[PDB]
Design a protein around this ligand. Structure first.
Ligand SMILES: Nc1ncnc2c1ncn2[C@@H]1O[C@H](COP(=O)(O)OP(=O)(O)O)[C@@H](O)[C@H]1O
Ligand SMILES: Nc1ncnc2c1ncn2[C@@H]1O[C@H](COP(=O)(O)OP(=O)(O)O)[C@@H](O)[C@H]1O
Ligand code: BEF
Ligand code: BEF
Ligand SMILES: [Mg+2]
Ligand SMILES: [Mg+2]
Lengths: 49, 417, 417
C-alpha cells in the first residue's frame, strides 16, 4: 500500500512516476471493465411484446 | 494549458484562439464549451495539458477538479481524478490541485489528471503528513484586522464605523443582521475592498448566494481575489454544492496555515436551501423548518475558527430579517447563539436616506479585548458610554456627521480629544 | 493501554507513537482515528489492552464505553460491552467501568471488554449490592459550599457576591436567569475555579451545551476536572445523548456516595433540543412547545438532590431570557417552580459596564438557614434589609464598590462592623 517515496529525483522519480502511471492505468482499466460488466449484467433483457 | 489562463479573458479571444486551432465554429457553442473544445484540440497537438482545480469527491471515490471561474460547479472542463490519487495522497474536498492532464478518449467523459504537481501551493509531501481541520484547536481572535482605508472616502466611514462599533479579526464568526433594502451590498463591497487594500496578506474570498447576476458581475470584477457565486439560476443542490465546496477549500487553506475571509450573503437563503434538501422526519418546527434542517447549516457556520497552529477562518454571513414569516427569523435566532460576533444594521434609519445605518447598540464582540490595544479599548468604552444615553437617531446622526467631519479613526480619537 | 492516557496529549505524540508502531501515515486520518489504529496495533503486539469509559445502553442490551475526552459521544474507540456483563453485574448508564479489552476481529466493529476490573473506582462487588439513585431519599442542602477564593481577585468578588446574595451547597438545584451579553461565561468560569481551589474534595463536572468551540477549548483547559461538552456541531440527538449520559454518570457517582457539581449552560437550548426530539401529540402550547416536551427536561432538572445516605448532586443550569419569543420564556417559567435555588443576573446593568450585575432582589434560596451559621445568617438578613430600600443602581454600585474595597467576605462583615 506504499508506492509513495522520494529521493534522487533524476532517475528514481522518473521510474517511480512511470510505475505509478502504470498502476493507475491498470486500476482504472480494471474498474472500467468492472463497471462495464456491472451495467451489462444489470441491464434487463427484451422478452416479448 | 491552464483553464483559468483561458478564462480570465472573454469569449472573443477564445474564439480567435480556436480559429487558430482550426476547429468548427466556436461562437455557436458556449464559451466554457469553447474552452473544452480548445483544450481537446490542444491535447490533440501531442502535449500534456497542465490543469488545476479544487477537488470534489463523489460517493464512487473519484474526484472532480472544479475550476474557480466556473463558480465551483459542474462543467465540461472538470478534470477527472482517478481514485488512485485518493489512495496515495488522500486529497480531501477543497484541496487546490494542479498537475498534468490528458484528453478524454471516446466514450469517456472529461480530462484525467495523471500526476499531481502542486498541492495547495505547496509540495505534495505536506499533503499526506498534515494535521486536519476539525482536528485543530479553535481559539479566539488574537490578531486585529483593521478596516479603515486611510484616505477618507465617503464609504470609508462604512469601514471605520465597524472599527468604532465592534472590531473584526482573524478566526472570528460574524453575523450581519439586516432587513431588505438596508445597505448590505455596498457595505460588504467596501469591506472587501478595505480588507484587500489595507491587509493584502490575507486571502479575500467573497461569497454570493442567490442574488442578481448583475450583482455577481459587479462583485467579481470590483474586488481583489476569487469571487465564486451561485445565483437563483441554480437550485438548492448547486447552492449547497458551492457552499460546502468553498467551505472545504477554506478548511484546507487554514490547514495550510493561511487566513481566509468568507463574506457570505445571505445565510438565510442558504438555510432555506438546506431545509429544502433535508429528509423529512415526519414533523415540522415553528415557522416551517425541519428538525435536522439546522445541523448542516450549523456545521457550515461553525467551520470558522481561530487556530493555535496556523491560519484562520473568519466568516461574515449576513442574516435577513423583516421577511414577514417566522422560519427566516427562526434561522436568525438559531444563529445568534452560535456566532461570537454580531453586527446589526438599521432599515428604519436607511429609509431616511441616512447611511450607513449600523445598530451601534446591539452590535458587539465577545472577547473584544483581544481585538484592540489597551488605551484604545478604554477610549472605545468611554465612547460607547457617550453613545448610550442618547436616542437612536441622536447616536446615528452624531456618528455620521462627526465621522464624515473626520478622515481616519485615530484622527477621530485625537479630535474628540 | 488506556485511551485517555493517549488522549491527554496532542496529535503529535500520537503520530510519533504510531510511527513507533510502524503503520500507515497517521496524520492523514483523524487523531481519534489515530488512537483507534494505534490501539489496534498495540493489541496486535499480543497484549490485552486496559480500557475505561462510561456505559451507554442501547435497545439491544449491549453497551458502549464512551470515553471522557471524546465528550461522551460515538467514536471508533468506544469499547463494546457484551450483554453478559449486564446480566452478571447489570451496570447501568453512567457507570465508569475499567477493564480488559480485546481487538476487533474483522467484520466486527470495535474493541470488546472481556472482564471488568474497576467499577466506579470501587470493587465490582459493590456494583450488584447497592442502593439506587431514584430509590434514594432526597433532602435539602445541609453542608455549605463556600465560594470565595481568599486572596482577593477582581472576579473573586463574583464568588463572594454569591456567598453574600444566596449561599450554595451540596444537593441544591440552582438556576441562572440571565439575558444574552450579561456575563454568564466568566461567572461560571470563576465559580468552577473557586469550587475547585477552595473545595477540592468534591467532583467538579462542568457542562457546556451548544456554544462556540473556542469557548469549549477555553473551558476544558482552564478548570479542574472533566469537561464534556456538545457544541452546535452536534444535532439535538447528540445533545440529549451527552446530557442524559452526564446526568446518569452523576447519578451513579452519587449512588457511590460522592458529590457532583454540574454547571450547565444553557438549559434553554437543552429544552429546545428536547422539544425537537419529542413525538407530536397533535397540539402545541403557548410559544410553540409540545405538550410532553417538558417531561424529560423536568426529569433531567430534578435529577439533582441531596441524599441521606451519601453523596450529593448540585446542578447550576443557566436560564436564558430576552430572546424575543415566548417559548424560551415558557421554559424559564416551567423551571422557576421546580428548582429550589434561583439566581438572577442583570443585563441592563451589564450594558453600563458594571460587572458583576447580579439581581440581589430576586435572588434567594429555599431553606437557606441550613446553608449558613446562625449569626452570619442574622448579619445577612440585616445586610439584605439595608440593601432593600435603595434603588437597583444604588444597591449594585454599593455592592461592587464596597466589595472591591474589601478582600474577603468575613473581612467585609468585620469592616461593615
Ligand atoms: N454608505 C452609503 N452611502 C450612500 N448611499 C447608500 C450607502 N449605503 C446604502 N446606500 C443606498 O442604498 C441603496 C442600495 O441598497 P442595497 O445595498 O441594495 O440594499 P441592502 O442594504 O438591502 O443590500 C443605494 O441606492 C444607495 O443610495
Ligand atoms: N466579573 C466581570 N468582570 C468584568 N467583565 C465582565 C464580568 N462578567 C462579565 N463581563 C463582561 O461580559 C462579557 C462576556 O459576557 P458573556 O458571559 O458572554 O454574556 P452571557 O452572560 O450572555 O454569557 C465580557 O466582554 C466581559 O467584559
Ligand atoms: F434588499 Be437586501 F438585498 F436584502
Ligand atoms: F450569549 Be450568552 F451566552 F447568553
Ligand atoms: Mg443587498
Ligand atoms: Mg455565556
Amino acid at each position: 500500500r506504499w508506492l509513495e517515496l522520494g529521493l534522487t529525483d533524476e532517475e528514481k522519480q522518473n521510474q517511480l512516476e512511470q510505475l505509478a502511471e502504470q498502476y493507475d492505468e491498470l486500476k482504472h482499466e480494471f474498474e472500467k471493465k468492472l463497471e462495464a460488466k456491472r451495467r451489462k449484467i444489470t441491464q434487463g433483457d427484451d422478452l416479448a411484446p | 494549458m491552464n483553464l483559468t489562463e483561458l478564462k480570465n479573458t472573454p469569449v472573443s479571444e477564445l474564439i480567435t484562439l480556436g480559429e487558430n486551432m482550426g476547429l468548427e465554429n466556436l461562437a455557436r457553442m458556449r464559451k466554457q464549451d469553447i474552452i473544452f473544445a480548445i483544450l481537446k484540440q490542444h491535447a490533440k497537438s501531442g502535449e500534456d495539458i497542465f490543469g488545476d482545480g479544487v477537488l470534489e469527491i463523489l460517493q464512487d471515490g473519484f474526484g472532480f477538479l472544479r475550476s474557480a471561474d466556473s463558480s465551483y460547479l459542474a462543467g465540461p472542463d472538470d478534470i477527472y481524478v482517478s481514485p488512485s490519487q485518493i489512495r496515495r495522497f488522500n486529497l480531501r474536498t477543497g484541496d487546490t490541485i494542479s498537475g498534468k492532464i490528458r484528453p478524454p478518449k471516446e466514450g469517456e467523459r472529461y480530462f484525467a489528471l495523471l500526476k499531481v504537481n502542486e498541492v495547495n501551493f505547496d509540495k505534495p509531501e505536506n499533503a499526506r503528513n498534515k494535521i486536519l481541520f476539525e482536528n485543530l484547536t479553535p481559539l479566539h481572535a488574537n490578531s486585529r484586522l483593521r478596516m479603515e482605508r486611510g484616505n477618507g472616502s465617503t464609504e470609508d466611514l462604512t469601514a471605520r464605523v465597524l472599527d468604532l462599533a465592534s472590531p473584526i479579526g482573524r478566526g472570528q464568526r460574524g453575523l450581519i443582521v439586516a432587513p431588505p433594502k438596508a445597505g448590505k451590498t455596498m457595505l460588504l463591497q467596501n469591506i472587501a475592498q478595505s480588507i484587500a487594500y489595507n491587509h493584502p496578506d490575507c486571502v479575500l474570498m467573497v461569497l454570493l448566494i442567490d442574488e442578481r447576476p448583475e450583482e455577481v458581475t459587479e462583485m467579481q470584477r470590483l474586488v481583489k481575489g476569487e469571487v465564486v457565486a451561485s445565483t437563483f439560476d441554480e437550485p438548492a443542490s448547486r447552492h449547497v454544492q458551492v457552499a460546502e465546496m468553498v467551505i472545504e477549500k477554506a478548511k484546507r487553506l487554514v490547514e495550510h496555515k493561511k487566513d481566509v475571509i468568507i463574506l457570505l450573503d445571505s445565510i438565510t437563503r442558504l438555510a432555506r436551501a438546506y431545509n429544502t434538501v433535508v429528509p423529512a422526519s415526519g414533523k415540522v418546527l415553528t415557522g416551517g423548518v425541519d428538525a435536522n434542517a439546522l445541523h448542516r447549516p450549523k456545521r457550515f457556520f461553525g467551520a470558522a475558527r481561530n487556530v493555535e497552529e496556523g491560519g484562520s477562518l473568519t466568516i461574515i454571513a449576513t442574516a435577513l430579517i423583516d421577511t414577514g414569516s417566522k422560519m427566516d427569523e427562526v434561522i436568525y435566532e438559531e444563529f445568534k447563539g452560535t456566532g461570537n460576533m454580531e453586527l446589526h444594521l438599521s432599515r428604519k434609519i436607511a429609509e431616511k436616506r441616512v447611511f450607513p445605518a449600523i445598530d451601534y447598540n446591539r452590535s458587539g464582540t465577545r472577547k473584544e479585548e483581544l481585538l484592540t490595544t489597551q488605551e484604545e479599548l478604554q477610549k472605545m468604552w468611554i465612547l460607547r458610554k457617550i453613545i448610550h444615553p442618547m436616542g437612536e437617531i441622536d447616536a446615528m446622526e452624531f456618528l455620521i456627521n462627526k465621522l464624515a467631519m473626520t478622515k481616519t479613526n485615530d484622527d477621530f480619537f485625537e479630535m474628540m480629544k
